[PDB]
Symmetry: D2
Subunit: 124 residues, 4 copies
C-alpha cells in the first residue's frame, strides 16, 4: 500500500491513537507521531498532518472526523530553522458518537510518505 503501517527502529511515523475518553455520548481522541521518540521537525523534514476517521459499528461507510495541519517548521526570512516556531504533530479530536467502532488515522511525512494507524473505540 501507499499507507505504511510498521515503524522503523530509529524514526517513528505511525500515528498513535489514544482514546482519552468515550462515555456519555462524547469522545476525546489524541493522535500523535513520535510522542515518546520525537520525529524530526525541521524546515526540510517534518510531519505535515494527521487526519482521523471513525466508522461506527453498523455504519456502512466511515466518516472523516477531522484533520490537523502542522504548519510551522522554523522557516523564516533569516533562513531555514530560524523562526523558533515548530508545530508539534499531535492533535486532539473531540466528537459526539452513539456507537462503538473503528478509528483509523493517516499521517504524512514530507519525505517519508504516508502512514496509517488503527484503534478500537469502545464507547461506554
Amino acid at each position: 500500500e501507499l499507507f505504511q503501517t510498521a515503524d522503523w527502529k530509529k524514526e517513528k511515523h505511525v500515528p498513535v491513537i489514544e482514546v482519552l475518553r468515550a462515555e456519555g455520548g462524547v469522545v476525546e481522541v489524541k493522535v500523535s507521531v513520535g510522542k515518546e521518540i520525537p520525529h524530526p521537525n525541521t524546515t526540510e523534514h517534518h510531519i505535515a498532518w494527521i487526519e482521523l476517521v471513525f466508522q461506527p459499528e453498523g455504519s456502512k461507510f466511515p466518516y472523516v472526523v477531522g484533520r490537523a495541519e502542522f504548519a510551522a517548521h522554523g522557516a523564516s526570512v533569516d533562513g531555514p530553522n530560524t523562526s523558533g516556531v515548530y508545530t508539534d504533530p499531535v492533535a486532539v479530536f473531540a466528537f459526539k458518537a452513539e456507537k462503538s467502532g473503528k478509528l483509523t488515522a493517516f499521517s504524512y511525512c514530507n519525505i517519508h510518505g504516508l502512514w496509517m494507524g488503527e484503534a478500537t473505540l469502545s464507547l461506554e
Copy 2:
C-alpha cells in the same frame, strides 16, 4: 469587514484562545468556538475549522501554526442529522515557541461567515 470580531447575544462564533501550558520551550494552546454557549453542529449549520497564527515579538511576519478541520456533522445515507457523529469545534495546537508574541485565530461558520479572535502569549 470580512473577519467579524464581536459575538452576537444568542449564538457564539468568536474563536476563544487559551494558553493551557508553557513549559520546556513548548506551548499548548486551545482554540474553541462556543465552549460556554455551544454553537449549533448540524448538517446545515456548523463551524467548519479553526486556524491558529502566531507572530513572535520582533518577527516581521506572522506564521501559521496550524489548522484544524471539523468534518463530521451528522450526515449519513439515512439523511441529515442521523449518523450520530459530530466533531466539536475545539482544537489544541502544541508548538515550540521561544518568545512572547501575538496569537490570532480565524474560524468559519458555514452560514455565518468568517471570524477572528486574538490573545497574547507571555513567556518570561
Copy 3:
C-alpha cells in the same frame, strides 16, 4: 479497505485523473468526481475534497502534490440549498516533475466514504 475503487451505476464517486499537459515536466493534472454524471451537491450530500499524490519512478516514497477542498454546498441563513453557491468537485494541480511515475487521487463523500483513483504520468 477504506478506499473504494469501483463506481456504482447511478452515482459516481471515483476521482478521475486526466493529465492535461506533461511537456518539459510542467505538468497539469485535472482530477474530478462526477465529471460526466454529476454527484449530488447539496447541503446534506457532497464531495468534500480531492487530494493528489505522485510518486516519481525511482522514488522510494510518494509525495502529496496538493489537496483541494470544496467548501460551499448551498447552506445559508435562509436554510439548506439556498445560498446559490456550490463548489464543484474538480481541481487542477499544476506542478513540476523530472520523471514519469504514478498518480494516486483520494476523495471523500460526506456520506459515502473514501475513494481512490490511479493513473500513470508519462512525461
Copy 4:
C-alpha cells in the same frame, strides 16, 4: 493588519484572481501567485495555499468556495531541493453562482506571512 495587499518589487505574493469562464450558471476562477514573476518554490521558501471566498451581492455573509494546498517543495530523503517535485501555487475553483458578487482570495508564504487579493464577479 495581518493580510498584506500591496506587492513588493522583486517578489510577488498578492494572489491574482481571474474569471476564466462564466456560463450555464457555473463560474471558473483561477487564482495564482507569481504568474508573471514566479515566487520562489524551494524546500525553504514557498507559497503553501490559496483560499477563495465569494460573497453574492445582497448576501449578508461571505462563503468559502474552497482551499488549495500546494504541498510539494522539493524535499526528499536526499535533502532539501532534491525530489524533483514542486507544486505551483495556482488553483482553479469551479462553482455554481447565481449572482454577481465580490471575490476575495487569501494566500500564505511560509516566510512572508499572509496576503489578500480581491476582484468582482459580474454576471449579467
